[PDB]
Amino acid sequence: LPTIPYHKLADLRYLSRASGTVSSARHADWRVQVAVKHLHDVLREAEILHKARFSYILPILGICNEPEFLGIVTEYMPNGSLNELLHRKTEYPDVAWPLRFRILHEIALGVNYLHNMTPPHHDLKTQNILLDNEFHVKIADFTIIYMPPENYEIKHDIYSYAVITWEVLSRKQPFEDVTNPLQIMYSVSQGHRPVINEESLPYDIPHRARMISLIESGWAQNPDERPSFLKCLIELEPVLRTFEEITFLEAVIQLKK
Amino acid sequence: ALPTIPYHKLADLRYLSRGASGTVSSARHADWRVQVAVKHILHKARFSYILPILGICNEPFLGIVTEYMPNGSLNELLHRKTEYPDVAWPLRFRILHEIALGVNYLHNMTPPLLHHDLKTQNILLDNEFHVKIADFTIIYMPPENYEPIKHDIYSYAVITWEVLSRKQPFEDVTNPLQIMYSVSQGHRPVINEESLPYDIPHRARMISLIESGWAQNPDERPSFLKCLIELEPVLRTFEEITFLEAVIQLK
Numbered sequence A: 001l002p003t004i005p006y007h008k009l010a011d012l013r014y015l016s017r018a019s020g021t022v023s024s025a026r027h028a029d030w031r032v033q034v035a036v037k038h039l040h041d042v043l044r045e046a047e048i049l050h051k052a053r054f055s056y057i058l059p060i061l062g063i064c065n066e067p068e069f070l071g072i073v074t075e076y077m078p079n080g081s082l083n084e085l086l087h088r089k090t091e092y093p094d095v096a097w098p099l100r101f102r103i104l105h106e107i108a109l110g111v112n113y114l115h116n117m118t119p120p121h122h123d124l125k126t127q128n129i130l131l132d133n134e135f136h137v138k139i140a141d142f143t144i145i146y147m148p149p150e151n152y153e154i155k156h157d158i159y160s161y162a163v164i165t166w167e168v169l170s171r172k173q174p175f176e177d178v179t180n181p182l183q184i185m186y187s188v189s190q191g192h193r194p195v196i197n198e199e200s201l202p203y204d205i206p207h208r209a210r211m212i213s214l215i216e217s218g219w220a221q222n223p224d225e226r227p228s229f230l231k232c233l234i235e236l237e238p239v240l241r242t243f244e245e246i247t248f249l250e251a252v253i254q255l256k257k
Numbered sequence B: 001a002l003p004t005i006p007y008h009k010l011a012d013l014r015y016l017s018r019g020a021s022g023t024v025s026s027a028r029h030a031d032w033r034v035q036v037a038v039k040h041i042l043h044k045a046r047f048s049y050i051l052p053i054l055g056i057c058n059e060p061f062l063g064i065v066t067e068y069m070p071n072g073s074l075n076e077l078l079h080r081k082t083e084y085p086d087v088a089w090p091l092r093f094r095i096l097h098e099i100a101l102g103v104n105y106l107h108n109m110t111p112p113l114l115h116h117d118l119k120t121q122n123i124l125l126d127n128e129f130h131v132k133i134a135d136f137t138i139i140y141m142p143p144e145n146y147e148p149i150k151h152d153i154y155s156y157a158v159i160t161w162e163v164l165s166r167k168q169p170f171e172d173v174t175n176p177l178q179i180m181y182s183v184s185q186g187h188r189p190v191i192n193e194e195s196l197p198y199d200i201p202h203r204a205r206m207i208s209l210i211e212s213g214w215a216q217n218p219d220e221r222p223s224f225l226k227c228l229i230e231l232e233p234v235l236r237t238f239e240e241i242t243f244l245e246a247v248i249q250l251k
């Protein structure tokens, strides 16, 4: 609702791959790049997601309802995932602070929108956080580093958001030294979190203390001791006013081809 | 489905525009913590270049809620020459390309929304000067529509002339009925060096597109696909950095 004929999807090249395979395609009629995910009803689930229209959630353009093939069609995000921006240090040697804070703001906005829905993400990660043409956040929802302990031992999303905040400010991989994901799950269940020091989070970080407190409270062992998305927004909004609108555009231009 | 927005969730309701189709006003959504716009089939239409309908008000009032477009209309950009002394070609060519994309999307719908009245005042500009059509003066009206479909292409050809010229389509003409008379007699906005300078990139291809687009005979007018096929090479002529540079220059 709308139904997209799979034959309308030209040049179906691979993007990412489990839940299904995400592939880039060119719409024959629309003359735009789209993204299509192959699924293994789902039509009812897809319909709930079509009601969700907000500037920071990935727009569902339609559905492929062929018998041999079933899939979800969304917009193609030309700047990939947040994971790619933070970690592809060869492509992105520098990622400006106004843009990093803008992403945090927009994630909190997007998640808070989903939380206020009737009825009200599933599992929030840097790989799900897509970046549009202008590096604006588009969350794409339905790795254990973002999973709160109580989910493997409601306030789930805030735990994920804290890890994403630590990852955005550090550009470090949460549990770098840890190889086996079970060792991560163990340490986390024992109260361990990604390290907070000068090496992980340098002193050059604007509003470092204000950020550290938000991360630390966000990834609290006790779900009840974790802030709301309203409180995050209430904590970021002052830090966002610290920059002029032109600096966000200058930050993005520093990444553009 | 389409969500229902309680009128009380709309804080700081300040006038924006009016507006042949009702009065548009900005507001802040209490829960979402964002600026929205509220005006006193469309929900199915979800495309990058169509203005997104966020929800509907039903408190007995019957208003449409969309996203707030911070950079106003295309009309404002082209004509507010003190505010916008320079509007770079990559951005102009991008606006045109994104209009053709948006209109062509509506044309391919099930059922198509050919029942539109396209004008520069309906073409809204997002935070990054990307187009968002909000299709829900006689200068954009084709002659055959004067007395109660290749309508949109006629409008698009006038919008194209207006984008490339930054001139008002019938400046000399005072009475709008005299516009209707001349147009019915085959007259169109002037195409010369003064209206359309020689510095215009792809001038000849653009002139052909406008001229064919605003043809007296609707059958002699192109498809939006023919526009897209003609613009796509033009837009590859610029680097992605020049579009953002063009936008930053608007400050």
Ligand SMILES: O=C(Nc1ccccc1Cl)c1cnn2ccccc12
Binding pocket: A015, A016, A022, A035, A036, A037, A058, A072, A073, A074, A075, A076, A077, A078, A080, A081, A130, A140, A141
């Ligand atoms: O994942 C994407 N879309 C998507 C998400 C959930 C379900 C179905 C779909 Cl099609 C997507 C869009 N652009 N893009 C670019 C790089 C990597 C992934 C994507």
Ligand SMILES: O=C(Nc1ccccc1Cl)c1cnn2ccccc12
Binding pocket: B016, B017, B024, B037, B038, B039, B051, B064, B065, B066, B067, B068, B069, B070, B072, B073, B124, B134, B136
């Ligand atoms: O017209 C707008 N929205 C709209 C369109 C059709 C129906 C209902 C609505 Cl609410 C609109 C949004 N931002 N903005 C800025 C300046 C002028 C007009 C607007």
